[PDB]
């Protein structure tokens, strides 16, 4: 909330719309005291869902040369904004 | 003297600390406040004691008020229950 | 020449540096940065602390990027355990990881300027950073070193109003960037101070292990969020801002773009965050819920053991790197079967960058060195560890 | 808890609580540092402003040092300070006589009161510090007064330790310095050209280590002591030693004590702090003392430190730049006297 | 709660591990792709510059950047320190670990020639663990105090050191002092005695 | 190359340990014993080298336990007697090896308690 | 075991009795593992303890309240894996992770039983047996504990 | 048994380095006292140097003496340069630390630790 | 043609097809002095051959690049020149030999 | 996807010299700072309008008490076994009611890190970490809190704590 002249002073001097993007929170802010929530929570044997025990001790290990992995696909310029 | 003693002996040099100062000591001893509470009468042989709350109190343990001889006391609240 | 030890207390840089310099008249002949002024022993102490009680060591390595440091450890401990975080948690880590990249860049661009002498950009953005802290405080409880991205997920769900408030901040933040944009991008004074200063050639950047915007600023194509994706970044779309003429300016322009690209990623995360729980719920790894531990015995035992003893991650070793705002932050965690780690080498994007200062700042005067440290975004917590 | 229970150092304890009254000035800041490094509690009574007692707060560890306000006019400040102590040390002493306090008060009346309460509180030791060569009719207002008090102390609280130190040198001293300061005003106007008067100077630490050893030494009870120091030097030579080490030109033009007496009078008039005064002038020129039979630092366990050694530290400031870097072997060699 | 993993990688990298082992038979003692899908080529200490040069400059394995150099100290092993070099290939989007063993008194070579990133990391390994790097330009303490005695990250070094600092008025300097801690660090013996079924 | 030397590789001077903590201090190689309170034998399998117990005293101000033994919380863990004696000799500490105490085989049978 | 619970029903409770001034039997903890009954009958020859009742209210406590008075008594604490009956003097003075454990020798009696002295912050908190096949094989006297 | 040499092969060869360091330090002590405005005398300091170079005077494993030199030289670099302030250098003199007594009766009389 | 190879240092190289042929051909030779059956010679000669095979099969740079699957050709060269240096360096370090020394016992057992 | 960031007719040449000679481009910055003196400062009146916080804000510790008046802490030692700064010492006894309570409790608030690993581990909600952050002290001793500077502390903010616990309990 500022005198229109003063704010047009800031819109003209800035060059950008300034009533729209406020750096100050007036009603933009969510009010506090949000209603209480209720967070979301057979054959559920832990032996089937064992992440910890699933891992194994490390594997120890004419012919054609092999790269560590297929060469990285080169990226391509962005469609929306190629140059900025 | 704190609810747990701690009172410094007059000779203790550890008393200078409180000179030009004083001693932080809570006046509300839980040994007595819990005694200033009505024994919770119950009908059932065993009773629960969530600490007067679900998830805002203490872990829920079932106490055996089976002998009037003894009012079960949940090890967490110190609340005596009168069968 | 003249050995002027740049001030350890000097207001420039991050105030934990010495940088003995040889002054060949006005220009600086050589730099020998003497870091160690903030070596608290982070890696030694972690060996004596359980995996949960070491997470905090991490948000305090690069205090500007809080939750991304943690996201590394959290990824490293998860891989050792072969468990993955639940879907909502992965989006929350990407949501918080992008808020940290905006806040690191607001830190790096604005503090570089005050070193240069521009004072207002810092004040306008820092108010925008206090708004962002509030988001950390309103999800974790602290405005810093939140300890929110824990192994298996985040510690607690997002509060009921956070995503609306993150939209309102992201909605208006873009104007704040180009407001700094108009202030510094075209100014004669900034371009002269920044352009063609500390040019680093592409092969030299890879050889010196720069691995960050310093790597991308010279035109090398590597982000680690699109090369080796972590979490759910594979499901969010963004453009890496690479640059040519590897000079401070191109590096500045890249940092301003990543703030803009992060708003694009934050936009997707709010639009597509899944309903679900925030922590994997095999109680062996992530602690049982407050109601469950107070009503079911298996949960009390699992809470007692997890808090008192620990996860006991299976024996192994892993190097997991995530794109922290500064650059590649990696933890080499060596683990015996015990609940507390055996070694935790924190690779700091910054130990490599500060080494480059002598090569990058050659044929440069005293004032250029202030810009050279500024464009490495070095915070000495990560370097000193 | 008089049982020291720890490896020597901070965080140990040697179990001796103490009230060191003059711990705002020159000697007490070292006493607290030794009593303190000896990890003994120290109730430091301060009438000063806290901003000036901070320099004392680190010379100790968590809880070791306790502060409380005391004003000599009123007791109960003396009483509560000494209430829980077992050791008491008296370091009160002022060169000039401020309008509110006379050599009477700072050297007799007060130490008496402190010792009064000391005995009343049951403290075992009342280490008291009176000046060396300081007896009745010693032709100096203070020294005479100082001895009068020594009696008052002994009377009220017998079995008290009484140290009588020689001139005390060491950083922030007003001995070497007073002489050094002469550089500012003309040249050293030494009476007797500085000859005919000899002074034994002792380092502050040597006295401080002695007071600390005495607080903890059993045989020290009811024992007077004189901390004379290693070498006896004639005044002219010591001013010349202060110069050369000060690296500023020296001129020992003479004059009679009576003139300088009248002179300092004016300096004393200075409201804040006399640069010099009749009493000081006297204790410098006329004051001369030969210890004869008193235990001393060696007896109490300190090897008196010669002035030849620790004089850089206290005069390296008084040099102009371009001389500041001057080392010690370069300093004009000194020489000792017997007389 | 079971990592989403790609078996393609295990195989592809395993295959590279055999490739590196075939190309350099003289220095590689054991190659293994762990189940975390990462690769580790363990080399004799003498192979530090040959193995890393082959990886930095080979068309089928370009490993341009040194992610980090660190040394785990297993006190039991005869050669306690286990220097580990983690390297990244921007070209093939993959990472490798070359780890070699060094004792207290046997130095290993310096890769500063192969990667200039290591100039600092090698100084930190010397300061932290005491491993010495041969023909290393300017090896000297990176992180510890100028006068520090002892190598801190060694498992045999006390957490809290032996010296601490304080300002002593009597000497007007920050003086060291044997360490006295007001609360020893309670060492918790938290480690279960029931082992997990593998 | 390959010079020959005959020392017990005393690195006592490369370690950096203050003399008094390398001279008057006895390591005690031993395989930790089981916590009678539990029956898990996973904490009695690796040899540990712990140092002597020196003064643990009380902080006068808060009553906490204080100490001046820098090497107090030190429990190096080895995998065999041989590798622990080596480390102690390597660092110049005095050792007191204690042989392992594995329970001997005690024959157990269910039916036995039914005899008469 | 299992990450979660499926027991949505009501738990049971037994009645704490007094077995002596050394053993605190908060026996609602008991997993009816009958180690106590056996030790009491096979190592210490005092057959005072026993099981009473069938079903889910089998409580392993003395039918009449007669204290378990015998040497070798405190071993029940160490041998009950559950914390149903534990030591009354060392009731709540500590918690095991903190206790620093130093292995030493029994001096109260001449059998020289091996023992582990558990010390926290410098005062002994409990002495529990450590196994010596020949001298004390996992057991220590009521006196030396 | 066989061991690779760090830098020197025989103890004698190495000692050549040990002396090339002694000299260096000796010729430096004077400089330090003046540069770092230390207060101890040239003689006094030079004494310390010998003490140290002497403290280590019992090892015979060349590799160890090859290693202590290096550590030794590094300490010069810092001291030659002023990378080390007065505090650092003066720490070699235990100025505040009260030297611990050694006599048994002198220890029994204080501190339960041996 | 190409105004600037993205990477800062690498500068546009005219005659890409030529520079390469020379570097690749030199290499195909340095490998010759390697022991008959040395993995390096057997594999690096397998690669260098395929690239020389395309360097001469296709005359359009941009095209060539896709085939060599490198970055800008100015890079395919940077690499061709380094392999040559490794090839020279490898022939001295003689990596093909039998292992220098087997690890001491238990020098690679992590759960220690 | 990658994006380039930094990659003459007289009309253009004059335009370039009109932006170098009659600087017109440092003017687009001066008007940019002129756009901000006329806006409302964000500064809050500090002592009178303290900034905004959340019920999750972790500050000064406090020991909650059961409504009856019975201390909630049952000396588990589940809160120093996790406290990473190694700050807590809670030596306990049977309190002579037969109950189970502390004789000792401690935080050294010059070691604590306000991580809240003690409020989430406590199975009874005894130790919390309140929303204080104005408790600076002129001395070192006033930060080594004892059980009575945490219990009467918790006898102070319990009207203000419980609202925030009840406000966040579900999310926890
Ligand atoms: C044909 C008719 C007869 C002939 C008539 C005369 C011939 C035509 C004359 C045309 C004159 C054009 C303007 C010339 C004067 C302006 C100063 C100038 O020449 O510019 C120098 C400098 C340019 O900077 P740069 O882009 O780096 O150029 C050098 C590149 N190597 O500029 C700078 O960078 C200086 C920047 C310093 C910081 C400036 C900050 C802003 C200042 C705002 C001031 C606002 C108030 C000004 C008015 C005050 C009035 C009292
Ligand atoms: N060379 C020397 O200094 C020698 C000293 N002595 C004796 O040793 C004692 C200590 O000397 P020194 O410390 O240098 O003397 P100071 O001038 O430093 O005064 C000693 C302390 O006494 C306090 N004090 C002075 N006057 C009063 C007063 N009226 N009421 C309360 N406190 C007061 C001062 O604190 P505040 O700032 O609050 O006044 C000061 O901290 C002296 O009494 C002196 O007689 C003996 C021989 C030589
Ligand atoms: C003032 C600053 C103090 C800094 C002092 C200095 O920097 C520190 C330092 O001495 S750096 C370590 C020196 N230590 C060695 O150089 C190894 C010596 N090696 C031996 O002593 C052998 O045992 C030998 C067989 C040679 C005995 O022969 P001898 O008795 O010397 O002759
Ligand atoms: S041993 Fe412990 S648990 Fe097993 S029965 Fe006897 S008491 Fe119940
Ligand atoms: S505070 Fe909570 S956790 Fe810490 S002891 Fe008391 S109850 Fe157990
Ligand atoms: S907050 Fe973290 S640090 Fe402070 S006490 Fe609770 S746990 Fe220990
Ligand atoms: Zn209850």
């Amino acid at each position: 909330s500022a005198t229109r002249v003063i704010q047009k002073l800031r819109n003209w001097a800035s060059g950008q719309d300034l009533q729209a993007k406020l750096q100050l929170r007036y009603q933009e802010i969510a009010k506090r005291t949000q209603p209480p929530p209720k967070l979301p929570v057979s054959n559920n044997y832990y032996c089937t869902r064992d992440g910890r025990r699933e891992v194994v001790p490390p594997s120890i290990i004419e012919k054609k040369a092999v790269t560590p992995a297929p060469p990285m696909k080169r990226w391509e310029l962005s469609k929306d904004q190629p140059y900025l | 003297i704190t609810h747990t003693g701690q009172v410094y002996d007059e000779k203790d040099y550890r008393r200078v600390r409180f000179v030009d100062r004083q001693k932080e000591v809570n006046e509300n001893f839980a040994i007595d406040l819990i005694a200033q509470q009505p024994v919770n009468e119950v009908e059932h042989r065993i009773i629960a004691c969530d600490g007067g709350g679900g998830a805002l109190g203490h872990p829920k343990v079932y106490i055996n008020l089976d002998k009037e001889t003894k009012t079960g006391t949940c090890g967490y609240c110190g609340l005596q229950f009168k069968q | 020449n003249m050995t002027l030890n740049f001030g350890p207390q000097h207001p420039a840089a991050h105030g934990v540096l010495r940088l003995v310099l040889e002054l060949s008249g006005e220009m600086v002949r050589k730099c020998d940065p003497h870091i160690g002024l903030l070596h608290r022993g982070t890696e030694k102490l972690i060996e004596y602390k359980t995996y949960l009680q070491a997470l905090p060591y991490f948000d305090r390595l690069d205090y500007v990027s809080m939750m991304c440091n943690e996201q590394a450890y959290s990824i490293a401990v998860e891989k050792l355990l072969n468990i993955q975080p639940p879907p909502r948690a992965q989006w929350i880590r990407v949501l918080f990881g992008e808020i940290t990249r905006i806040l690191n860049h607001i830190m790096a661009v604005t503090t570089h300027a005050l070193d240069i002498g521009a004072m207002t950009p810092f004040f306008w953005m820092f108010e925008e950073r206090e708004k962002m802290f509030e988001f950390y405080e309103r999800v974790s409880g602290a405005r810093m070193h939140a300890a929110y991205i824990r192994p298996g997920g985040v510690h607690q769900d997002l509060p009921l109003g956070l995503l609306d408030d993150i939209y309102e901040f992201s909605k208006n933040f873009s104007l704040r960037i180009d407001e700094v944009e108009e202030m510094l991008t075209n100014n004669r004074i900034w371009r002269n101070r920044t352009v063609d200063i500390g040019v680093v050639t592409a092969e030299d950047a890879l050889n010196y292990g720069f691995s960050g915007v310093m790597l991308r600023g010279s035109g090398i194509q590597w982000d680690l969020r699109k090369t080796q994706p972590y979490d759910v970044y594979d499901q969010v779309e963004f453009d890496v801002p690479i640059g040519s003429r590897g000079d401070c300016y191109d590096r500045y322009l890249c940092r301003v773009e990543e703030m803009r690209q992060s708003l694009r990623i934050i936009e997707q995360c709010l639009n597509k965050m899944p309903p679900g729980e925030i922590k994997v719920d095999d109680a062996k790894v992530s602690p049982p819920k407050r109601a469950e531990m107070k009503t079911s015995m298996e949960s009390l035992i699992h809470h007692f053991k997890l808090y008192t003893e620990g996860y006991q991650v299976p024996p192994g070793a892993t190097y997991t790197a995530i794109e922290a705002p500064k650059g590649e932050f990696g933890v080499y965690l060596v683990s015996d079967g015990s609940s507390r780690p055996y070694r935790c080498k924190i690779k700091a994007p910054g130990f490599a960058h500060l080494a480059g200062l002598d090569k990058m700042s050659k044929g440069h005067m005293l004032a250029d060195v202030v810009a050279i440290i500024g464009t490495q975004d070095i915070v000495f917590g990560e370097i000193d560890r | 808890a008089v049982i020291p229970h720890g490896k020597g150092g901070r965080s140990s304890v040697s179990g001796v609580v103490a009230t060191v009254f003059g711990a705002t000035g020159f000697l007490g800041r070292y006493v607290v540092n030794h009593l303190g490094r000896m990890g003994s509690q120290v109730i430091i009574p301060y009438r000063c402003d806290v901003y000036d007692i901070m320099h004392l707060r680190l010379m100790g560890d968590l809880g070791q040092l306790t502060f409380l306000e005391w004003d000599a006019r009123d007791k109960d400040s003396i009483r509560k300070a000494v209430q829980h102590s077992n050791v008491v040390i008296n370091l009160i002493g002022r060169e000039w006589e401020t309008r509110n306090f006379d050599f009477e008060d700072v050297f007799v009346n007060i130490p008496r009161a402190i010792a009064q309460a000391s005995k009343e509180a049951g403290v075992e030791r009342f280490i008291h510090v009176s000046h060396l060569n300081a007896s009745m009719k010693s032709s100096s207002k203070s020294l005479r007064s100082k001895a009068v008090g020594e009696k008052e102390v002994r009377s009220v609280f017998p079995e008290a330790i009484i140290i009588r130190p020689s001139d005390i040198f060491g950083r922030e001293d007003r001995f070497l310095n007073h002489f050094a300061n002469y550089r500012w005003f003309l040249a050293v106007p030494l009476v007797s050209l500085g000859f005919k008067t000899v002074k034994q100077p002792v380092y502050v630490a040597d006295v401080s280590k002695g007071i600390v050893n005495a607080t903890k030494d059993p045989d020290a009870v009811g024992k007077t002591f004189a901390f004379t120091g290693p070498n006896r030097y004639l005044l002219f030579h010591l001013v010349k030693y202060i110069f050369g080490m000060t690296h500023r030109t020296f001129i020992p033009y003479p004059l009679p004590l009576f003139v300088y007496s009248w002179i300092g009078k004016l300096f004393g008039l200075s409201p804040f702090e006399p640069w010099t005064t009749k009493d000081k002038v006297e204790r410098i020129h006329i004051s001369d003392v030969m210890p004869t039979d008193l235990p001393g630092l060696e007896d109490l366990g300190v090897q008196p430190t010669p002035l030849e050694l620790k004089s850089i530290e206290v005069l390296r400031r008084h040099r102009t730049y371009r001389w500041l870097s001057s080392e010690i072997e370069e300093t004009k060699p000194a020489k000792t006297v017997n007389y | 709660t079971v990592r989403p993993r790609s078996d393609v990688t295990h195989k592809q990298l395993s295959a590279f591990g055999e490739y590196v082992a075939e190309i350099l038979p003289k220095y590689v003692q054991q190659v293994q792709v762990s189940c975390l899908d990462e690769l580790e080529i363990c080399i004799h200490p003498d192979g530090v510059i040959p193995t890393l040069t082959f990886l930095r400059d080979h068309t089928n394995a370009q490993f341009k950047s040194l992610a980090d150099l660190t040394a785990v100290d297993v006190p039991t092993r005869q050669n306690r320190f286990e220097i580990v070099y983690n390297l990244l290939s921007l070209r093939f989007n993959s990472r490798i670990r070359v780890k070699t063993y060094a004792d207290e008194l046997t130095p290993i070579d310096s890769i500063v020639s192969v990667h200039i990133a290591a100039n600092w990391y090698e100084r930190e390994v010397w300061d932290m663990f005491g491993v010495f790097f041969f023909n290393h330009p300017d090896l000297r303490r990176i992180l510890t105090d100028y006068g520090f005695e002892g190598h801190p990250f060694r498992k045999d070094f006390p957490l809290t050191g032996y010296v601490e600092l304080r300002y002593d008025d009597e000497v007007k300097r920050v003086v060291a002092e044997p360490v006295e801690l007001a609360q020893e660090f309670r060492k918790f013996d938290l480690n279960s005695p029931w082992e997990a079924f593998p | 190359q390959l010079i020959t030397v005959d020392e017990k590789l005393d690195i006592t001077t490369l370690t950096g340990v203050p003399e008094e903590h390398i001279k008057t201090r006895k390591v005690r190689i031993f395989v930790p014993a089981r916590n009678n309170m539990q029956s898990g034998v996973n904490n009695t399998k690796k040899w540990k080298m712990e140092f002597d117990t020196r003064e643990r005293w009380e902080n006068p101000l808060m009553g906490w336990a204080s100490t001046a033994d820098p090497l107090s919380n030190m429990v190096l863990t080895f995998s065999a007697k041989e590798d622990a004696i080596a480390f102690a000799e390597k660092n110049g500490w005095s050792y007191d090896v204690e042989e392992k105490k594995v329970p001997k085989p005690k024959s157990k049978s269910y039916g036995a308690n039914f005899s008469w | 075991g299992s990450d979660r619970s499926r027991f949505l029903e009501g738990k049971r409770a037994v009645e704490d009795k007094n077995i002596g001034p050394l053993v605190k039997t908060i026996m609602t903890r008991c997993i009816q593992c009958t180690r106590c009954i056996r030790f009491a009958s096979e190592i210490a020859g005092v057959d005072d303890l026993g099981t009473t009742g069938r079903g889910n209210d089998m409580q392993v406590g003395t039918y009449i309240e007669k204290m378990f008075m015998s040497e070798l008594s405190g071993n029940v604490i160490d041998i009950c894996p559950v914390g149903a009956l534990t030591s009354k003097p060392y009731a709540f003075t500590a918690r095991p992770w903190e206790t620093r454990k130093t292995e030493s020798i029994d001096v109260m009696d001449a059998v020289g039983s091996n023992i582990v002295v558990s010390t926290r912050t410098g005062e002994v908190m409990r002495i529990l047996p450590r196994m010596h096949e020949d001298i004390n094989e996992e057991w220590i006297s009521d006196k030396t504990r | 048994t066989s061991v690779k040499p760090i830098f020197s092969r025989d103890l004698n060869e190495a000692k050549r380095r040990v002396r090339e360091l002694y000299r260096a330090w000796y010729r430096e002590v004077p400089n330090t006292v003046h540069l770092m405005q230390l207060d101890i005398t040239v003689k006094q300091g030079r004494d310390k140097v010998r003490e140290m170079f002497m403290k280590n005077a019992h090892v015979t494993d060349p590799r160890v003496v090859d290693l202590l030199v290096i550590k030794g030289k590094m300490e010069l670099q810092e001291t030659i340069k002023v990378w080390k302030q007065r505090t650092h250098v003066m720490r070699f003199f235990h100025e505040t630390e009260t030297p611990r007594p050694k006599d048994f009766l002198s220890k029994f009389y204080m501190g339960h630790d041996p | 043609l190409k105004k600037t190879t993205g990477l800062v240092g690498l500068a546009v190289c005219d005659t890409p097809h030529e520079r390469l042929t020379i570097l690749y051909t030199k290499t195909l030779d340095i490998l010759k002095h390697f022991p008959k059956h040395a993995a390096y010679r057997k594999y690096t000669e397998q690669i260098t051959n395929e690239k020389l095979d395309m360097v001469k099969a296709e005359p359009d740079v941009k095209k060539l690049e896709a085939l060599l699957q490198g970055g800008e050709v100015e890079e395919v060269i940077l690499q061709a020149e380094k392999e040559l240096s490794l090839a020279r360096k490898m022939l001295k370090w003689k990596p093909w030999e039998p292992l220098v020394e087997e690890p001491p016992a238990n020098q690679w057992k992590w759960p220690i | 996807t990658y994006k380039y960031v930094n990659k003459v007719d007289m009309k253009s040449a004059t335009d370039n010299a009109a932006r170098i000679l009659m600087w017109t481009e440092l003017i687009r910055g001066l008007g940019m700072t002129l756009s901000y003196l006329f806006r409302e400062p964000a500064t809050i009146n500090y002592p009178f309008e303290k900034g905004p916080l959340s019920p999750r804000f972790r500050g000064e510790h406090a020991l909650r008490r059961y409504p009856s008046g019975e201390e909630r802490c049952i000396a588990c030692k589940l809160c120093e076994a996790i406290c990473p700064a190694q700050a807590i010492t809670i030596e306990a006894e049977p309190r002579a009611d037969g109950s189970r309570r502390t004789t000792r409790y401690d935080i050294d608030m010059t070691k604590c890190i306000y991580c809240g690993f003690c409020q989430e581990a406590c199975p009874v909600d005894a130790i919390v970490e309140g929303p204080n952050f104005e408790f600076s002290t002129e001395t070192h001793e006033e930060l080594l809190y004892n059980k009575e500077k945490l219990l009467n502390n918790g006898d102070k903010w319990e009207a203000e704590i419980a609202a925030n616990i009840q406000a966040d309990y579900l999310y926890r």
Side-chain angles (χ1 to χ4, degrees), chain B residues 49 58 74 77:
Chain B
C49 190
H58 75 89
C74 56
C77 296

Side-chain angles (χ1 to χ4, degrees), chain H:
Chain H
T1 186
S2 304
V3 288
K4 285 189 176 301
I6 295 169
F7 275 118
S8 309
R9 189 146 292 91
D10 315 345
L11 186 45
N12 299 356
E13 312 178 0
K15 296 186 57 181
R16 181 177 65 83
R17 296 183 181 277
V18 180
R19 291 193 297 274
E20 296 174 14
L21 181 54
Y22 188 97
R23 307 183 191 179
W25 269 103
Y26 193 90
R27 287 192 159 90
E28 172 60 21
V29 180
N31 193 22
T32 73
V33 176
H34 175 74
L35 295 189
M36 299 182 179
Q37 296 284 349
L38 310 178
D39 59 7
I40 49 89
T41 169
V42 176
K43 172 55 173 53
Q44 176 176 184
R46 282 170 160 175
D47 301 340
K48 186 71 179 181
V49 176
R50 198 191 174 193
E51 159 188 353
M52 319 285 292
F53 278 72
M54 200 62 59
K55 164 173 49 185
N56 260 320
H58 52 265
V59 62
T60 57
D61 182 356
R63 299 177 297 172
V64 179
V65 174
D66 297 327
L67 195 289
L68 295 172
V69 171
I70 302 178
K71 291 184 171 175
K73 290 189 299 183
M74 295 181 183
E75 280 201 6
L76 246 193
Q77 187 179 16
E78 300 171 355
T79 307
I80 288 178
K81 310 195 59 59
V82 197
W83 287 347
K84 302 176 61 177
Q85 299 190 182
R86 303 180 53 263
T87 294
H88 305 265
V89 286
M90 197 70 172
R91 290 171 185 179
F92 288 83
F93 304 86
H94 318 279
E95 303 293 346
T96 70
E97 184 178 2
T98 61
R100 50 183 59 265
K102 302 298 300 178
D103 170 24
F104 167 89
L105 195 62
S106 297
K107 300 176 305 179
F108 166 91
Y109 272 161
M110 46 168 291
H112 325 273
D113 64 9

Side-chain angles (χ1 to χ4, degrees), chain B residues 46 62-67, chain G residues 11-17:
Chain B
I46 177 181
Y62 292 81
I63 298 87
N64 199 357
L65 288 51
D66 189 24
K67 44 187 175 183
Chain G
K11 299 180 182 297
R12 55 176 182 183
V14 175
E15 288 290 353
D16 291 345
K17 299 296 183 181

Side-chain angles (χ1 to χ4, degrees), chain C residues 288-299:
Chain C
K289 249 182 229 196
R290 297 286 293 172
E292 267 189 317
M293 66 174 282
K294 285 168 202 205
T295 47
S296 64
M297 161 73 55
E298 295 85 357
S299 315

